Design a protein around this nucleic acid. Structure first.
Ligand SMILES: [Mg+2]
Ligand SMILES: [Mg+2]
Ligand SMILES: [Mg+2]
Ligand SMILES: [Mg+2]
Ligand SMILES: [Mg+2]
Ligand SMILES: [Mg+2]
Ligand SMILES: [Mg+2]
Ligand SMILES: [Mg+2]
Ligand SMILES: [Mg+2]
Ligand SMILES: [Mg+2]
Ligand SMILES: [Mg+2]
Ligand SMILES: [Mg+2]
Ligand SMILES: [Mg+2]
Ligand SMILES: [Mg+2]
Ligand SMILES: [Mg+2]
Ligand SMILES: [Mg+2]
Ligand SMILES: [Mg+2]
Ligand SMILES: [Mg+2]
Ligand SMILES: [Mg+2]
Ligand SMILES: [Mg+2]
Ligand SMILES: [Mg+2]
Ligand SMILES: [Mg+2]
Ligand SMILES: [Mg+2]
Ligand SMILES: [Mg+2]
Ligand SMILES: [Mg+2]
Ligand SMILES: [Mg+2]
Ligand SMILES: [Mg+2]
Ligand SMILES: [Mg+2]
Ligand SMILES: [Mg+2]
Lengths: 128, 52, 53, 187, 149, 124, 147
RNA sequence: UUCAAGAGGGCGUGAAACCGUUAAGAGGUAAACGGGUGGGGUCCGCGCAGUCCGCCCGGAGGAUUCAACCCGGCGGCGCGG
RNA sequence: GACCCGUCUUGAAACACGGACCAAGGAGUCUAACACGUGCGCGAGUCGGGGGCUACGAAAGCCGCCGUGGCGCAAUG
RNA sequence: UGGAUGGCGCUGGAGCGUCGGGCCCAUACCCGGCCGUCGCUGGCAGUCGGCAGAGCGAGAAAGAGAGUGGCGCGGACGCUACGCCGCGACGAGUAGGAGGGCCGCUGCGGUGAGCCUUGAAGCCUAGGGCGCGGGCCCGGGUGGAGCCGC
């Protein structure tokens, strides 16, 4: 009822939330982006108990299930029709994601061509 | 405040040098001026020797 | 008076010219540069002297 | 918890060259091959010497090759220098040779071909002799630069011959106090 | 918190972690070394069984500065063929009765990785005489290998 | 030569593409389309290319000879196959096998053309 | 190459690579070479011995042309005259000798350093040295002066 | 009136702090956060009878239909000892 | 489970100081010299930087009886 | 100031002294999975195919050694060598040092037969997702003329 991936492995991840900057909610001029705090009084860098955790490398993911969509496909970014001849050999692993600025008179001829080659397109009903 | 081992040296910049700085951006537009005032000199005296 | 200009040696300027003439003869380093050379019959293309006329 | 000091776990030797040319990396691709596959250590020495810098593969002059080839026993024997070969003019009698170097200067190349010699490259050393037999290996003077006359024990310090850094040597640049015996001291 | 003269010894018997065990042959020149670290060790004299249940279970080799286990005789017979030691039961006759070639089968054995003792030690610091765990205990060490091994 | 211009082309060509931690290539006679030494088609003396027919049906096969290498006009040769499914794959297994012509590119030059025959079917 | 420096990798660190206890102030130890004799004494007594004092005689209107005298060795004395003259000179049985001019080639004085191959020469120069004269008298050939 | 007042005489775009009103969910240890679940909402599944591709046997259908020879054209290796 | 962040400090939650709130702007740069590592060319020699000759181009290319000159090849009193 | 075996409270103890058995838990020790660095200067140019025949991991320095009278038209993946694959031990960290950044901004030579009034930048978002992270990408709204990747 879809285009099946080749093999469907069980995706496990080691952390599902984000990281937020320390003292981000008390202010507004503090964004929710990560900046390694460099004080000397501090509690986060010295890893007290019950505080905000930090981004070490141990949260890295397995090289077999990295960058994998939940459907089991990798992504690839496409502007025109000419770059879908790339994927007629690498087919069952990677998927195409049509860019934003492409207007709605061309996506009618890209998605049809990407239905003969049996290539999955992530956003096939974008504009209409 | 010299460190371990470097040569001693005395720079001559204790004066105000930024006021008197002679740039040379003229140079490829003065070799053309001298080339014109030498060829129009070489055509004023038509059969004479050009080099003095 | 920031140091705008640079100078390079002579015998490196001439080695770059010999190393840029030696790769305008292969039909792969020209196609991969981007030109459209699918049909030209000979890559060191030498034409008669009546083009200056 | 284990009280190993992690101070010198990483070796600081060099693996691969910093050079971006491709006529060196096409020969490294052939002796990376011939260093893990064959048994003999001539390849494992020349590989190590194709990584080092310019100031650690110094130029071998030709009269240290006539000297280091006139030694009895080494007849009909090719040389291998990973460095370069420059010409000399203070030699009037050159014998025939068989040299395998990188760069041969255009006065000495023509000095040897007139004397009936022969210059190979490091691909025809591979066709001629892979496992390293019947090659005399050389190198140039390592500690020959002028820098190595500044180093060592600091001057003004007894029993120490060492050139200091002077902007110009003369009759009043560093001659006076620590050197004479009447102006203070000597060392 | 370790004394510097001690830590050299515990790195001359190759005892780097906590809960590491080795086999040491005895003489006058190694009793006085094992006397200076009486507060940190608990040594004994093992039975025949607790050499089997340390070689067969927690016994790993040392092949080229690595740690490769023992699943065949040919892993021994590479590095000990020059001593007529071609299996495991010759290495055990050597350790139990200490043969001439004890050094070349004790530098080869990687230090053992024991677990935490079940049940619980009495008190770590003091001597085994006054109700501790350190010091000599000549044949109670098989009541600490059947517990930890 | 070959290893000279792989050491040149491997990173600064224009048929090359880099995005999403990936790498592809748009050479005119490539298959699997990815930048490697064996699947480039501008360097070697012998190259295999498989293209769709210029018309709606069929599969063309672009070879390359050895005589006129520097003459890009008559260096290649195009043939056209418009047949059923078995004998086309057999006449490509034969073109690449029984001439000993670059035998490394056989299975991928059958897979890509069995995907052109899958492609040019009337869709339901 | 602003992008290869160090300060572009230090945006985020507070002190910018110069400490926090004793900060990077302007001039701690005087400006330039201050304290040759007071408190930078050890650097000059250990790395520039004899920085301090006077020695010798003064000489006021000193030119660098009255004492112009470039040198040469006997090693490369044959490099001035081209190769085919040393050949014809070693080839002829008569007993002639090729004349070597140094002043023409930009040298005045003839010193003597190395071995010299055995064939007769005649040297026109302005000075000599005693070893470099007894090597040519020992091979055979002369030493001719010129003003 | 204009394509447009969602461009109205300091009139392109119209950001946050901030305030007004609407809808929801709460409220005795100042509020806020971290780790962990649970409930309630908004939404997507363009989910709501769930794989496909090879190969053989069987069942029924139909073509412009195979192997082989014959001419014509191209291409490849040639150690022709 | 959990005291508010920056900062000097042996020692910050501190009865130590600056800080009501949001947007934009904001702090190791530029020459000369020297020292050492490193990449490139030529090699006992090397370098044309000043001078000449023939839209982009105020660029590029040449000159050796224009190599004078600089550093180097020989130190010491 | 109204207050401290930590609190409530505790006398066949929940008090003091000597000792038994059994049980609780930390990021410590063992075993297992995953990331990353270091390390063996570890392993692959032998995809050698009807001219072929499928090789060296075996306890014992050295050639499945060469010369010698003694029917069918068939065989996965790979290797951007700055790559890919395998085995071991290790990982705390201020001032400070170094390396990698397919993180990012504004601009120039090159190049994408790039995209764009069938709607670009920029904003907004209880919309869908990836990355250790810096950050980016997509859908849905406003907006009206120039923009991005290598
Ligand atoms: Mg502190
Ligand atoms: Mg200082
Ligand atoms: Mg550990
Ligand atoms: Mg450390
Ligand atoms: Mg238990
Ligand atoms: Mg820091
Ligand atoms: Mg610093
Ligand atoms: Mg400061
Ligand atoms: Mg101080
Ligand atoms: Mg400073
Ligand atoms: Mg509008
Ligand atoms: Mg407005
Ligand atoms: Mg409101
Ligand atoms: Mg409510
Ligand atoms: Mg609590
Ligand atoms: Mg302060
Ligand atoms: Mg102070
Ligand atoms: Mg104080
Ligand atoms: Mg301090
Ligand atoms: Mg503080
Ligand atoms: Mg103050
Ligand atoms: Mg205040
Ligand atoms: Mg700003
Ligand atoms: Mg240098
Ligand atoms: Mg636990
Ligand atoms: Mg483990
Ligand atoms: Mg660490
Ligand atoms: Mg919001
Ligand atoms: Mg407008």
């Amino acid at each position: 009822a879809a285009l099946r991936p080749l093999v469907k492995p069980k995706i496990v991840k080691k952390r599902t939330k984000k990281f937020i900057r320390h003292q981000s909610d008390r202010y507004v001029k503090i964004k929710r982006n990560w900046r390694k705090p460099r004080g000397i009084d501090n509690r986060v860098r010295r890893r007290f108990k019950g505080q905000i955790l930090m981004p070490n490398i141990g949260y890295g993911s397995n090289k077999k299930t990295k960058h994998m969509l939940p459907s089991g496909f990798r992504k690839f970014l496409v502007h025109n029709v000419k770059e879908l001849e790339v994927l007629l050999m690498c087919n069952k692993s990677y998927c195409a994601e049509i860019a934003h600025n492409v207007s709605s008179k061309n996506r009618k001829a890209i998605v049809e061509r990407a239905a003969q080659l049996a290539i999955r397109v992530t956003n096939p009903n974008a504009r209409l | 405040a010299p460190s371990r081992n470097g040569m001693i040296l005395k720079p001559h910049f204790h004066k105000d040098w930024q006021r008197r700085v002679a740039t040379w951006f003229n140079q490829p537009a003065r070799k053309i001026r001298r080339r014109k005032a030498r060829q129009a000199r070489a055509r004023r005296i038509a059969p004479r020797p050009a080099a003095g | 008076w920031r140091r705008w200009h640079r100078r390079v040696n002579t015998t490196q300027k001439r080695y770059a010219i010999c190393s840029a003439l030696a790769a305008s003869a292969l039909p792969a380093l020209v196609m991969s540069k981007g030109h459209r050379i699918e049909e030209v019959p000979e890559l060191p293309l030498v034409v008669e002297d009546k083009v200056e006329g | 918890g284990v009280d190993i000091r992690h101070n010198k776990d990483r070796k600081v030797r060099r693996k691969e060259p910093k050079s971006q040319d491709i006529y060196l990396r096409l020969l490294v691709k052939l002796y990376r091959f011939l260093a893990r596959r064959t048994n003999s250590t001539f390849n494992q020495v020349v590989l190590k010497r194709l990584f080092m810098s310019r100031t650690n593969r110094p130029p071998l002059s030709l009269s240290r090759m006539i000297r280091k080839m006139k030694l009895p026993g080494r007849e009909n024997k090719t040389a291998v220098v990973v460095g370069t070969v420059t010409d000399d003019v203070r030699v009037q009698e050159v014998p025939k040779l068989k040299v395998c170097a990188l760069r041969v200067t255009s006065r000495a190349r023509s000095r040897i071909l007139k004397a009936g010699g022969k210059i190979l490259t490091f691909d025809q050393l591979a066709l001629d002799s892979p496992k390293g037999r019947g090659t005399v290996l050389l190198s140039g003077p390592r500690k020959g630069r002028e820098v190595y006359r500044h180093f060592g024990k600091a001057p003004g310090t007894p029993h120490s011959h060492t050139k200091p850094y002077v902007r110009s040597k003369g009759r009043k640049f560093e001659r006076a106090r620590g050197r004479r015996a009447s102006r203070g001291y000597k060392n | 918190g370790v004394s510097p003269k001690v830590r050299k010894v515990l790195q001359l018997l190759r005892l780097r972690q906590i809960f590491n065990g080795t086999f040491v042959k005895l003489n006058k020149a190694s009793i006085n070394m094992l006397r200076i670290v009486e507060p940190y060790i608990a040594w004994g004299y093992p039975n025949l069984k607790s050499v089997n249940e340390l070689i067969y279970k927690r016994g790993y080799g040392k092949i080229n500065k690595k740690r490769i286990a023992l699943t065949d005789n040919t892993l021994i017979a590479r590095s000990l063929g020059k001593y007529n030691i071609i299996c495991m039961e010759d290495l055990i006759h050597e350790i139990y009765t200490v043969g001439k070639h004890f050094k070349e089968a004790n530098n080869f054995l990687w230090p053992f990785k024991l677990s935490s003792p079940r049940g619980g030690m009495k008190k770590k610091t003091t001597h085994f005489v006054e109700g501790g765990d350190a010091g000599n205990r000549e044949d109670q060490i098989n009541r600490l290998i059947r517990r930890m091994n | 030569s070959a290893h000279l211009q792989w050491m040149v082309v491997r990173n600064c060509s224009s048929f090359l593409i880099k995005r999403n931690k990936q790498t592809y290539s748009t050479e005119p006679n490539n298959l699997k389309a990815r930048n490697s030494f064996r699947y480039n088609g501008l360097i070697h003396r012998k190259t295999v290319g498989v293209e769709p027919a210029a018309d709606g049906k069929g599969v063309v096969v672009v070879m390359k000879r050895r005589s006129g290498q520097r003459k890009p006009a008559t260096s290649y040769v195009r043939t056209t196959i418009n047949k059923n499914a078995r004998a086309t794959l057999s006449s490509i297994r034969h073109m690449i096998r029984k001439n000993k012509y670059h035998p490394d590119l056989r299975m991928a030059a059958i897979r890509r053309a069995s995907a052109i025959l899958r492609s040019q079917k009337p869709v339901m | 190459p602003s992008r290869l420096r160090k300060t572009r990798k230090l945006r985020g660190h507070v002190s910018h690579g110069h400490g926090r206890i004793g900060k990077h102030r302007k001039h701690p130890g005087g400006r330039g070479n201050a304290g040759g004799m007071h408190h930078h004494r050890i650097n000059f007594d250990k790395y520039h011995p004899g920085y301090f004092g006077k020695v010798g005689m003064r000489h006021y209107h000193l030119k660098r042309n009255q004492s112009f005298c470039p040198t040469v060795n006997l090693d490369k004395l044959w490099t001035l005259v081209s190769e085919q003259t040393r050949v014809n000179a070693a080839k002829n049985k008569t007993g002639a000798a090729p004349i070597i001019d140094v002043v023409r080639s930009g040298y005045y004085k003839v010193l003597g350093k190395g071995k010299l191959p055995k064939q007769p020469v005649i040297v026109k120069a302005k000075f000599f040295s005693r070893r470099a004269e007894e090597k040519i008298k020992g091979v055979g050939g002369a030493c001719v002066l010129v003003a």
